[PDB]
Amino acid sequence: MQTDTSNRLKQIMAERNLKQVDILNLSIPFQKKFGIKLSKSTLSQYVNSVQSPDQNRIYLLAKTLGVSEAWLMGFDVPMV
């Protein structure tokens, strides 16, 4: 596709003034809620586009940031 998960995370970091450390912080309550872990290292791998998130982390980050899963995956759809 045209857009990556990497691109979307970067779009959110810029538009919402969040660094990776902030996003990771926001996710922790949801990590415990869902019982699904996201480490700092793995998050940077998503941002730098070295790794693409599995469907577990797509859901996690999407609920954390309040965006749609499809959007977060890079698809050309509405954000909310």
Closest to 42 measured CA to CA, from 64, 20, 70: 20
**Domains defined along the chain, listed by start:** 1-80 (1.10.260.40)
How far is 28 from 39, CA to CA, in rounded Å?
9
d(CA 11, CA 46): 13
Question: Residue by residue, what is the 3-state secondary structure of 33-66?
Answer: HHCCCCCHHHHHHHHCCCCCCCHHHHHHHHHHHC
Task: Give the separation between CA 59 and CA 34, rounded to whole angstroms.
Answer: 10
How many of the other CB atoms lie within 10 Å of CB of 64? 22
Q: Is 63 exposed, middle or buried (0-12, 13-18, 19+ CB in 10 A)?
A: middle
* DSSP symbol at 28: H
- Write down how long the chain is: 80
